[PDB]
Assembly symmetry: D2
Homo-oligomer: 175 residues x 4
C-alpha cells in the first residue's frame, strides 16, 4: 500500500508475536517456580496476544490465504532463513568473537533448510494431485481413530469414525 499504516502493521505484527513467545516461556517458568495460577494467566495472556497479531496479519494479506499460497509463503520464508539471515548472522558473530553463538545460529540454519524441503514436498503433492493418491499402493492411517486402509488411493470417508478424506495420511512406523 506504500502507507505508514502498512509499516505500522508490520511493526505491530512483530512484538505481538514476540509477546506471545515471552509469555509462553514465562508460563513454564512460573509453573516450575510454584505458581500454577500465574502460569495460566501468562498463557491466557499469550493467547490474547496471539489473537491480536491475527488482526494485523489478516489486514496485511486481505484475509487468510489458502493452503497453496500459505505453503508458498512459508517455503520462501524458510529459504530466506538459511540462505540470508542465519548465514549473515553467523559471520557477524564470528567477526566479534562469538564462536559459540555462531555455531548455534548454524545448527538452527540447518533446521530451516529441512523446513523448506518439507514445505516444498507438501506443495508438490497438492499441485501434482498426489496429496491423497500414490502412484503405488500404500498404507493409509486415520488421524481420528487409527483405521488402516491399504490402497493406491485414500478413502473418501473413513469406514469407522465416518470422518472425511482429510484425516488420512501415509502411515509411518519409525520405531
Amino acid at each position: 500500500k506504500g502507507t505508514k499504516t502498512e509499516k505500522n502493521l508490520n511493526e505491530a505484527f512483530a512484538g505481538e508475536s514476540m509477546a506471545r513467545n515471552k509469555y509462553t516461556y514465562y508460563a513454564s517458568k512460573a509453573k516450575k517456580d510454584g505458581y500454577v495460577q500465574i502460569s495460566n494467566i501468562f498463557e491466557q495472556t499469550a493467547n490474547n496476544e496471539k489473537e491480536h497479531a491475527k488482526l494485523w496479519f489478516k489486514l496485511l494479506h486481505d484475509g487468510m490465504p489458502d493452503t497453496v499460497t500459505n505453503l508458498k509463503d512459508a517455503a520462501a520464508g524458510e529459504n530466506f532463513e538459511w540462505t540470508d539471515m542465519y548465514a549473515r548472522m553467523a559471520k557477524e558473530a564470528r567477526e566479534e568473537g562469538f564462536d559459540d553463538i555462531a555455531d548455534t545460529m548454524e545448527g538452527v540454519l540447518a533446521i530451516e533448510k529441512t523446513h523448506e524441503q518439507r514445505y516444498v514436498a507438501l506443495l508438490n503433492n497438492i499441485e501434482d494431485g498426489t496429496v491423497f493418491e500414490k502412484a503405488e499402493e500404500t498404507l493409509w492411517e486415520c488421524l481420528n481413530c487409527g483405521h488402516l486402509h491399504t490402497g493406491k488411493t485414500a478413502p473418501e470417508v473413513c469406514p469407522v469414525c465416518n470422518h472425511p478424506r482429510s484425516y488420512f495420511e501415509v502411515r509411518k512406523e519409525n520405531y
Copy 2:
C-alpha cells in the same frame, strides 16, 4: 555482549521466528478448513520448532531464564510501552490517512494491553507482599488439579485429596 551487532542480530532473529510461529499456527488452522489434517499437523509441528529456536535467542539476550519475580516486572513494562506509546502513535497515524476502522481496532487493542499491565502488577504485588497463598481475609481456595475446596486465610500446605502442593491452589471465584 551489549552494544554489538550480534545483539542487533540476536534481537532480530527473536522476531521473525516469533513471527513464523504465529503464521504456522494460522497456516495450520487454514489447513484443516482446506481439508489437509497432516499439513495442518506439520505446520503446527514447525511452529513449535520455531518456538524453541526463539527461546535460544531469548535466553542469550536475558542471560538464561529469569525468575518469575523479574518476569512479571518485564512483562508489566512491556505492556506499559504498548498502550502509552506504541499503539498510541499508530492510532493517530492511521486516522490521519483515512483508515478510521484500523485505528479503532488499534485503540481497542490498546485498552487490552492496559489491563494486561494492571493484571501483571497485581500478581507481582502478591509475591512481594506474600499474599499469593495467604490472605488476611478468610477466603475460599480451590485446587486446580482436582477441585478440592478449602476455606480459610491460608492455602493448604498439601491438597488432602490429590496430594498436590500449594502451587495448585488459587482464590476461587464463580463468574456467572
Copy 3:
C-alpha cells in the same frame, strides 16, 4: 432398550474411557522416564480411544444432545455420585479398616457436590436467560482477544476481534 447390544455399547463406552485414562497416565510416566516418542505414542492412542468411545456414545444418545440436555445429564450423574456411589463406597471402605482411602473418597465426594452446583448454575443461566444478560451493569471479558465491556448485556459482536457474543463471560479477577 433391552438388547445385549445396548449393554455391549454401554460397556464398550466404559472400557474405551478407561483406556483413554490409562494411556494419558502412561504418556506422562514415559515422558518422565526419558521417552518422548513413546510418550507421544501413548497420547495419540488415548485420543483414538477417545474417538472410539465417541462412536458408542453417539449411538446410545441418538446423536449428540444440545448443551441444555447435556447440562441436565451432567448434573444428574453428578448428583448420583455424591449422594449414592461415593457415599456407599466410603462406608464400605471403613468396614474393612481402609480409613485412609475412605477419607479420599469423601474428599472426592465433596468435589462432585460442587460440580453439581456449577452445572445447575449454568443451566439456570440458560433457562432464565441470564447467560449474556444481567440485572446489574457488569464487566464482560472476551475470551478470544481480552476486550473488556461494561454494561448489563454482553456485546452482540466483539468490536476488537469481531467474534460473536459466545466468547464473552463475566470477568472474575481472582487474585
Copy 4:
C-alpha cells in the same frame, strides 16, 4: 486384594473415566452451541475427573509403574479388546440385526490389534536396548527443536537446543 474396596475402586475408576469422556464431548458441543465459557467449564471439570480416576488407578496399581510395566500392561489390554471383548460384541450385534454398527465394532477391532503390536514394538525396543541406538546408520530428529543427526546412536544431548536424548526419535517422512 479380594476385598469389596478392590471392586469399588475399580468401579470408581470407571464412570470417573466415563465422565471425562462425556464432559469432553459436552465441551465440543457447547462451543458449537455458542457457549465458550460453558465449554471451558465442561473442559475444566473433565480435567478434574481425570485426576480423581488417577487416584483410584494408582491405588489399585500401587503407585505408578515403570514404562516397561506400562507397555506390558497396555499391550495385554488391547489384546483383550480384539481377541475377546469386541470379538464377542461383533457377533452379538449381528445375531440381533444391527449390521450397521456391527461393521464398526469389527473396524474398531482391527484398530486395537494395531495398537497391541505397536506397543510390543516399543517394548521390544526397550528390552533390546534399541530405542536410541541402532545397528544401522539411521537419521534421528530432535522432537523439541527439529535438529537432524545421522548416526548409529542418538546424540547424548542435542547440540542445538541442549535437550536430552529423550526428545530424539527415528525420522520417517511419510509424505
